Amino acid sequence: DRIDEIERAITKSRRYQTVAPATVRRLARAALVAARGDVPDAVKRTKRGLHEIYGAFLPPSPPNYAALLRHLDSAVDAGDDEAVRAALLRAMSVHISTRERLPHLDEFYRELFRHLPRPNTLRDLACGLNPLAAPWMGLPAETVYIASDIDARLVGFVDEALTRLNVPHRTNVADLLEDRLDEPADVTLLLKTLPCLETQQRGSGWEVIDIVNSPNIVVTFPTKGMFQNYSQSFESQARERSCRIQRLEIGNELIYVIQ
Numbered sequence: 001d002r003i004d005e006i007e008r009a010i011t012k013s014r015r016y017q018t019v020a021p022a023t024v025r026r027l028a029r030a031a032l033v034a035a036r037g038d039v040p041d042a043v044k045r046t047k048r049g050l051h052e053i054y055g056a057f058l059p060p061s062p063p064n065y066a067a068l069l070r071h072l073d074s075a076v077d078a079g080d081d082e083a084v085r086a087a088l089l090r091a092m093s094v095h096i097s098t099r100e101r102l103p104h105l106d107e108f109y110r111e112l113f114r115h116l117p118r119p120n121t122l123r124d125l126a127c128g129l130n131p132l133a134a135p136w137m138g139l140p141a142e143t144v145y146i147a148s149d150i151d152a153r154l155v156g157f158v159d160e161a162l163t164r165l166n167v168p169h170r171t172n173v174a175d176l177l178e179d180r181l182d183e184p185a186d187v188t189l190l191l192k193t194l195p196c197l198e199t200q201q202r203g204s205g206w207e208v209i210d211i212v213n214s215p216n217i218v219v220t221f222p223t224k225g226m227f228q229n230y231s232q233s234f235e236s237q238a239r240e241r242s243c244r245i246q247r248l249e250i251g252n253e254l255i256y257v258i259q
């Protein structure tokens, strides 16, 4: 009853109107217990929690996805590869995380796929605007891109972008802490995701790595003593499980390829 109330307020006329209901409800429940039953404060907690796991990386108000697509259409409808790339870089820049990787985008994916097999299916979890890269990924023509995140509009825009790029795909609104990860997929990307999962649920990071049905997994961490912190814990945790891993560092991103 009080959860629906919190949800209604979270239909945030601002930053959170389209966040996955599964996510709002999970955060709202814990917020209510933490708030001693007080809805207003529970609403505050939920919002602050949403900002930490999602809002912090996006604009104060919904991105102008219509303009971004417009520009993409112009490039594609003109058959100009340069314009398409430009329109994709501009779009990705709206999301803080993808923005951080753009300065080393080509190097990042060129190197990454040298340590991965040719994928039949690529899964991108907590994807953000990363799927807009890919023309940079040199994927086999038939590869199906499966992308998911916690906001319907963001994911919807990713779907439209992939459609314009003629990339076989399937997009969903999924919360890594609840939704299933049993679908088969050759490679799964978990770029700059673990730190956020840890903040929401201790130990969930490696739990996801453990259950995700993929023999190849990429886990990255942002480095901008951040490198120190992330590399030390992940590696000790990997060595504890005897996970075969290969480490790389491109741009401000620590990279681990898990087989």
Ligand SMILES: C[S@@+](CC[C@H](N)C(=O)[O-])C[C@H]1O[C@@H](n2cnc3c(N)ncnc32)[C@H](O)[C@@H]1O
Residues within 6 Å of the ligand: 053, 054, 057, 097, 098, 099, 125, 126, 127, 128, 129, 130, 148, 149, 150, 151, 174, 175, 176, 177, 190, 191, 192, 193, 196, 197, 200
């Ligand atoms: C630091 S970003 C990285 C985004 C993208 N993978 C990239 O590297 O360019 C974090 C993303 O994780 C996502 N996220 C946070 N919590 C999530 C959850 N519980 N389930 C799925 N995605 C989540 C957010 O929506 C946010 O886009």
